[PDB]
């Protein structure tokens, strides 16, 4: 297992150094998106939470296809403001309820170190 804590202030530095294998060792869900919301990476802990197979969701659009319950001002809207402003770093609670038992989570969205992709981090609450 990888020793990085959910919500660490340098989290994007640590994850920049990891391959696909190491992402699967995190204690929390990790999804990497491009500026359009297409899924670039999706780790095993996130599938454990949502029941999605990471190999099937990679390449799909998070907001249009995989997670329509996040297509809302409070989730997708904050993502789009962050992409546009170049500053994305926010934490909030949310409920995932599309094709799954309604599940309360804490979400941390943050821009990647290179500034051209974006992380969504998820843990149960
Ligand atoms: C509501 O539609 C949320 C869906 C969702 C969140 C996170 C995932 O990894 C997969 C689906």
Numbering used by the authors: 1 to 125
Task: Give the exact sentences the study uses for this entry.
In these experiments, bacterial proteins with different functions were investigated. Microcrystals of photoactive yellow protein (PYP), a blue-light photoreceptor from Halorhodospira halophila, were used to explore the capability of microsecond X-ray pulses. A nitrite-reducing enzyme, cytochrome c nitrite reductase (ccNiR) from Shewanella oneidensis, was exploited to investigate potential secondary radiation damage, caused by 90 µs pulses, at heme centers. Finally, a first TR-SSX experiment was performed on the photosensory core module (PCM) of a bacterial phytochrome from the nonphotosynthetic myxobacterium Stigmatella aurantiaca.
PYP is a small protein (14 kDa, 125 amino acids) that covalently binds p-coumaric acid (pCA) to a conserved cysteine residue via a thioester bond. We used both a fixed target and a tape drive to collect SSX data from PYP microcrystals on beamline ID29. The PYPPEG crystals belonged to space group P65. The PYPPEG crystals diffracted to higher resolution than the PYPMal crystals. PYP in space group P65 only forms four contacts between symmetry-related copies within 5 Å, while in space group P63 eight contacts are formed. Despite the denser packing of the P63 crystals, the crystals grown from PEG diffract to better resolution. Microcrystals suspended in viscous PEG are best used with fixed targets and tape drives, both of which were used in this study. The highly diffracting PYPPEG crystals were used for calibration and detector geometry refinement and for optimizing the key parameters for data collection from other proteins.
